[PDB]
Structure formats: structure tokens, C-alpha cells
Structure 1
Amino acid sequence: FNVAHGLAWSYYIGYLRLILPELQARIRTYNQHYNNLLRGAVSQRLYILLPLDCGVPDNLSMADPNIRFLDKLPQQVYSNSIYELLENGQRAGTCVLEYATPLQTLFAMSQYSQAGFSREDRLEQAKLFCRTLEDILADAPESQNNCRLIAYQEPAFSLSQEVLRHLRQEEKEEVTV
């Protein structure tokens, strides 16, 4: 009994597979502007946050003030937000960012006593969710190239630094190959 299997297939089949094909185009179009204006550039991939603690806030800035809302991404109806990642008050990167909503279900199940679903169970299923979604995106046409999973366990931490590490690695890969 692994709720993560169905959660990952539902998230892919019912959302990612539908939104991702439009995204590269929406982002390029925006980047004409962003460039001419702030000489900036938004990464072309959807960055999906996968906190293993299944903590999804209503606004990213609350999880880290160095993650600042910049703009809504226009449509070519799906709402997607571009954020700037700050270091010492300076813009260090920009990207389309959002949390994987299925993790909220895992959180809610761990607080729903009738489910018999412990915090240990929640963590196990959050990891399984990440692995399954990775497997799906690996076999998937282009979708894998249109997004990046950012999974992290917080100790008992800077989310903006984690995202910047990925953005910088993404650029490195782009220019070296």
C-alpha cells in the first residue's frame, strides 16, 4: 500500500504532462521582455520543489525571504509565478518555481488519524513520490527536459541557496555540452 504511486501518476498525467509543453514557449516570450528590460533571463525549465517534510506554505517567501515573487508568467488557464533568488540583496537568479502539491496530501494524511499514517510513513511516501516521479519523467518525451525536481530534507537551511545550486548547475551543463 503506497499512496505515492498514484499521487505521482496523477500529478504527471493530470498536470505536468498538460502544462509542460506550453512552458518553454511562455518562458521564451517573457524572456524577450525580461532581457530588454532588466537584462535578465528566466531559466527555461519548471522547478518543482519537493520538501521531504511535506511542508508547503501558501507563499514561497515565507519559506525563505531570499525567494521573492517577480512576475506571473503569461499564457501562450494555468497560473505560474517567476521568482528571483537573492544573495545579499542582489538578484542571483530567476526561475519558474512551485511546490509539488501532492505532498500536501501526504501532510494532511499524517494529521488525519483515521488514515493510520505516521510521520515515518509520510517521509517514506514523500521519498517514494520523488523516486516515482523521477522514473516517470525519465521515460517521458521532452517533459524530463522541461522541468527539474528539487528534493531536499531540512535539518532539525537556505531554500534559495538550494535552488541557486540547481540553476547554476543547469547553466554549467548548458554551456559545456
Structure 2
Amino acid sequence: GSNVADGLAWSYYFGYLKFVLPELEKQIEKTSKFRSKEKFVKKMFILIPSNCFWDDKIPGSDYDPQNRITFEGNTEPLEKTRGGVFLRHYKHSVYEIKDGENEPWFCIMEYATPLLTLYDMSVAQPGELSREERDAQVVVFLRKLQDILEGDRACQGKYELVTFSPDRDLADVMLRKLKDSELEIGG
């Protein structure tokens, strides 16, 4: 078949999210600065740009036109062993998002790395994956990943999928989502 996104969503889960999402809050809390910080939503915000593409660095990128996103630091790495072929250490980037004159938020943001395969495929093998087929596979990927994560009780409340057009301001998008998150002061 040509439905690559199904396999991409399942391996993204079993090769990564299944074991980092339940532990993310605990990993974050290993750092005193992160324990001390309020307005630090502890969910992984998984970024899904509709064009499967991004600038390697989020702060100041085309998705951050107002330069309101700042890299703060990394979480304490988690150790995980599977198959012994190659070793795996997992860590995440914490960002600060300005909220006007108020206290800025901290959050975890990461592009959905399987989108790289959709992008690479559309550029190197256009006969296998047209631009339009890639657009559709992003949606398949999104809906399958949703089904997978919603079926795992250990992942509940630990992530948020963020879909956006490359024309949108990620700082504005994230700010709205952070304000809408369940986390309250002292939570």
C-alpha cells in the first residue's frame, strides 16, 4: 500500500511516546528550577505543521515572527533499553513563552518527528508521494496517532497535538493552548 502514515504513527508511539509520556512530569520535576516554576504546563505539546516542515530551531523561526519563544533548557534524560541494537537516551526541550507583561509560561514543545519521513519522501520520491498525497497523509497520521494515544490510559492528559498552517504564529497558538490547559497555580 501507499498508506505510510499508519506505520509512522504506531512506531512513533511504540518507539518513543509510549514510554516518555507517562514519565515526562516526573522527569521535569527532577530539576529544581522546574519544580520552582509556576505556569509550567507539563504536557508534551506535539507540533504538527500541515506542510511537514520546520526550521530546526523554534525560537525566532518563521513560526515565531514576534520572537516570543525562548529555549530554556532540556529535561533530565530518561534511559530506555529495547533490542540492544542501538542505545537510547530521551530528553525534551523546555521553552519560555512570553505572556505580555505577565509571568511567562514554560512548556514542552517538539515537532512530530515522523513528519520528516513524509517530507523527505515527497521530495526524494515524488512518484511515491505527491504534495497532495502528503497533505492527506498528515491527516491520516494525526487521526491514527489520536486513536493510539487515546487508547493508552497511561498517556491520558500527558500530551496535546497541535496542528497549524505554516502561516500561523506559533506563539499565539501556544499561548491559547497553555491558558486552556488544566494546570492551575500550585498544581
Q: Flag structure 2 segments of 5+ consecutive residues without an equivalent.
A: 79-88
1:152 paired to 2:164: yes
Match of 2:51?
53
CA 1:89–1:98 in 2, change beyond 3 Å: closer, same or farther? farther
Bigger RCO of structures 1 and 2 (CA < 8 A, at least 6 apart): 2
TM-score by length of 1: 0.85
SS in 1 for 2:106: strand
Deviations 1:103-156 (A, max 9, x none): 11111111013643111111100111011100111111221321111111234x
C-alpha displacement at 1:87, in angstroms? 4.0
C-alpha displacement at 1:71, in angstroms? 1.2
Does the 8 Å contact 2:74/2:92 carry over to 1?
yes
Match of 2:8?
7
SS in 1 for 2:55: coil
Aligned equivalents of 2:76 and 2:25: distance in 1?
Answer: 12
The one-letter amino acid paired with 1:123 is D
Match of 2:176 among 154, 165, 174: 165
RMSD: 2.2
Percentage identity across paired residues of the two chains: 35
Aligned equivalents of 2:54 and 2:161: distance in 1?
Answer: 15
Does the 8 Å contact 2:41/2:107 carry over to 1?
yes
Match of 1:113?
125
Match of 2:84?
none
C-alpha displacement at 1:35, in angstroms? 5.3
* Count of matched residue pairs: 170
C-alpha displacement at 1:84, in angstroms? 0.6
Does the 8 Å contact 1:45/1:147 carry over to 2?
yes
Aligned equivalents of 2:182 and 2:153: distance in 1?
Answer: 22
1:1-177 to 2 correspondences below 5 Å: 1-30=2-31, 32-34=32-34, 36=36, 39-61=37-59, 62=61, 63-64=63-64, 65-75=67-77, 77-88=89-100, 92-113=104-125, 115-155=127-167, 157-171=168-182
Q: Identify the range of structure 1 (88-97 vs 69-78) with the bigger mean alpha-carbon deviation.
A: 88-97
SS in 2 for 1:29: coil
Deviations 1:21-61 (A, max 9, x none): 2211012333x43454xx53421111110111101221111
The one-letter amino acid paired with 1:143 is C
Does the 8 Å contact 2:29/2:35 carry over to 1?
no
The one-letter amino acid paired with 1:131 is R
Q: Identify the range of structure 1 (12-21 vs 82-91) with the bigger mean alpha-carbon deviation.
A: 82-91
Aligned equivalents of 2:33 and 2:69: distance in 1?
Answer: 21
Does the 8 Å contact 2:99/2:105 carry over to 1?
no
The one-letter amino acid paired with 2:26 is A
Q: Identify the range of structure 1 (64-73 vs 100-109) with the bigger mean alpha-carbon deviation.
A: 64-73
CA 1:41–1:168 in 2, change beyond 3 Å: closer, same or farther? closer
